[PDB]
Design a binder for this molecule. Structure first.
Ligand SMILES: *[C@@H]1O[C@H](CO)[C@@H](O[C@@H]2O[C@H](CO)[C@@H](O)[C@H](O)[C@H]2NC(C)=O)[C@H](O)[C@H]1NC(C)=O
Ligand SMILES: *[C@@H]1O[C@H](CO)[C@@H](O)[C@H](O)[C@H]1NC(C)=O
Lengths: 50, 50
């Protein structure tokens, strides 16, 4: 594109337009929880003792 | 170090086929729908059988 520059000329709009756009933003994530003994040792008890 | 010796080598393969050789152990009945620790051909654990 190339707009024409001049030192004695101006451009003025004669009509408008109403537009509606959309914006999306994350807010929060999932809350989780972990259990060390169940994850690492499972059903064993000697592993828990270690 | 130069005297003769006698050698016997025992080789085991793990459980992939149905078990055939293992030592003495009495077997109980099957109990289901109850938290219980079990032993199936040498593997241990704790859970519910269904
Ligand atoms: C400003 O723009 C609006 C929107 O296009 C124009 O309104 C349209 O005009 C035409 C021609 O008369 C009609 O066929 C349409 O029905 C009108 N509405 C729409 C939504 O298009 C309006 O005429 C323009 N203003 C000027 C001064 O040109
Ligand atoms: C305005 O623009 C013209 C053309 O670019 C140039 O010749 C002139 O010197 C400029 N200034 C005036 C005061 O005209």
């Amino acid at each position: 594109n190339s707009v024409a520059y001049s030192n004695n000329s101006i451009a003025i709009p004669t009509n408008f337009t109403i537009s509606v756009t959309t914006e999306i933003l994350p807010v929060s994530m999932t809350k989780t929880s972990v259990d060390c003994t169940m994850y690492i040792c499972g059903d064993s008890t000697e592993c828990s003792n270690l | 170090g130069h005297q003769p010796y006698r050698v016997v080598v025992l080789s085991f393969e793990l459980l992939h086929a149905p078990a055939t050789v293992c030592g003495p152990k009495k077997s109980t009945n099957l109990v289901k729908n109850k938290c219980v620790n079990f032993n199936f051909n040498g593997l241990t654990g704790t859970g519910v059988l269904t």
